Design an enzyme around this catalytic site. Structure first.
Site, short mmCIF file in Angstrom:
data_model
loop_
_atom_site.label_atom_id
_atom_site.label_comp_id
_atom_site.label_asym_id
_atom_site.label_seq_id
_atom_site.Cartn_x
_atom_site.Cartn_y
_atom_site.Cartn_z
N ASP A 1 0.86 -1.16 0.00
CA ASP A 1 0.00 0.00 0.00
C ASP A 1 0.92 1.25 0.00
OD1 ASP A 1 -2.19 1.84 0.48
OD2 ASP A 1 -1.90 1.64 2.66
N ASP B 1 -0.12 5.21 0.85
CA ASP B 1 -0.40 6.13 1.95
C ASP B 1 -0.46 5.40 3.27
OD1 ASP B 1 -0.99 8.74 0.38
OD2 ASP B 1 -2.27 7.23 -0.57
N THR C 1 -3.16 0.96 -4.22
CA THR C 1 -3.72 2.12 -3.56
C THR C 1 -5.21 2.28 -3.83
OG1 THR C 1 -3.49 4.53 -3.29
CG2 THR C 1 -2.91 3.61 -5.47
N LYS D 1 -7.74 -4.90 -3.20
CA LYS D 1 -6.30 -4.89 -3.46
C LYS D 1 -5.75 -6.33 -3.51
CE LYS D 1 -5.40 -0.43 -1.24
NZ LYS D 1 -4.46 0.26 -0.34
N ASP E 1 -2.12 -0.64 5.99
CA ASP E 1 -2.51 0.00 7.27
C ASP E 1 -4.03 0.26 7.39
OD1 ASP E 1 -2.56 2.14 5.38
OD2 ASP E 1 -2.16 3.60 6.97
#
Ligand SMILES: [Ca+2]
Length: 259
Positions: free
Chosen positions: A7, A9, A41, A185, A208
Site C-alpha cells: 500500500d 499512503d 492504492t 487490493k 494499514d
C-alpha cells in the site's frame, strides 16, 4: 518472496506522503536482485502520477482498490467496475444527508454530489445533480464524512443491501468506499501475481487500512503497519505488526529480509 506488494499512503509513503531516498534505494536494491514490486492504492491512477514518476523502477500499479491495474507503461490491463444498477443507487443513496459527501470515480473523472503538492497531477472534481451522472465506468463510489461514527450504519446498510455484489471498505475513518464484489487490493494482487508468473504464496504484502485487509490475509505473508487502524489489527490478530511508516518501517523490513 518474489513479489513485494505494498500500500502507499500510511505504508510505503512517509507521514508527509513522500517516497524517501532510503525507500527509493530499497526498491532499486531489490529490483537488481530480481524482486518484483506491486503498488496498491485506493487513489485514482491520475492521482499516483508523481509517485510512479519517482519510484525509479518498473512496476504494476493497482489503483481504485483493485478496480484498475496498469502496467509500467501506463497501459490499463483491466477495469473492474461496479454493476450499473448498484452505481446508479450509490449515486443517490445519501443525497440528502448534509453530513456525507458522495464521491465517484468514473473512468478518468472525479464526481462529487456537492462541495465539501505543486508538482502533483491536476485532478479536480465535477459536480453532479440527481440523475445527471452516467452509471457506467464506475471504479468506485466513496462517502466522505468528518463523523466516523455516522458512516458505520451506512457501511452495515450497504453490506446488507447488496452482499457479494459489493466490496464495502473504509480507507480512512472519514472515507467509506464501495467497489464491485470481488474487487479488492488482494484480488487485484492475485491477478497481478499471475501476470508475473507467480501466485499469492510468492507475495509479501504491507498495509494499514481496511482496504488492505484482503491483500494482507490473501498474500503468502502479510504485515500490518504500527500506525494502522485498530479495526484492521483486531480483524487480523494473526498478522505481524511491524513499525510505523514514520520509521520507514517497510523498506527497513525489506532490507533486513532480502539484503
Ligand atoms: Ca493506507
Amino acid at each position: 518472496y518474489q513479489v513485494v506488494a505494498s500500500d502507499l499512503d500510511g505504508t510505503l509513503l512517509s507521514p508527509d506522503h513522500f517516497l524517501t531516498p532510503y525507500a527509493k534505494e530499497t526498491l532499486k536494491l531489490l529490483t537488481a536482485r530480481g524482486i518484483n514490486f506491486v503498488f496498491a492504492t485506493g487513489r485514482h491512477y491520475i492521482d499516483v502520477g508523481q509517485i510512479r514518476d519517482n519510484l525509479g523502477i518498473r512496476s504494476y500499479m493497482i489503483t481504485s482498490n483493485g478496480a484498475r491495474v496498469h502496467d509500467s507503461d501506463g497501459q490499463q490491463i483491466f477495469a473492474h467496475n461496479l454493476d450499473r444498477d448498484i452505481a446508479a443507487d450509490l449515486f443517490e443513496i445519501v443525497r440528502n444527508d448534509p453530513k456525507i459527501v458522495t464521491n465517484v470515480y468514473r473512468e478518468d473523472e472525479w464526481y462529487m454530489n456537492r462541495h465539501r503538492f505543486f508538482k502533483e497531477a491536476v485532478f479536480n472534481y465535477k459536480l453532479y445533480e440527481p440523475g445527471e451522472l452516467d452509471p457506467q465506468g464506475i471504479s468506485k463510489v466513496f462517502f466522505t464524512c468528518e463523523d466516523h461514527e455516522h458512516l458505520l450504519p451506512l457501511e452495515q446498510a450497504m453490506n446488507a443491501r447488496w452482499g457479494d455484489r459489493v466490496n464495502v471498505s473504509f480507507s480512512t475513518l472519514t472515507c467509506l468506499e464501495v467497489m464491485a464484489g470481488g474487487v479488492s487490493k488482494g484480488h487485484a494482487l492475485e491477478a497481478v501475481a499471475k501476470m508475473l508468473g507467480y501466485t499469492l504464496s510468492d507475495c509479501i504484502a504491507f498495509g494499514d487500512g481496511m482496504n488492505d485487509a484482503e491483500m494482507l490475509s490473501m498474500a503468502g505473508k502479510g504485515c500490518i503497519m504500527a500506525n494502522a487502524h485498530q479495526r484492521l489489527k483486531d480483524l487480523h490478530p494473526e498478522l505481524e505488526v511491524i513499525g510505523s511508516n514514520a520509521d520507514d518501517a517497510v523498506p527497513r523490513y525489506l532490507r533486513k529480509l532480502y539484503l
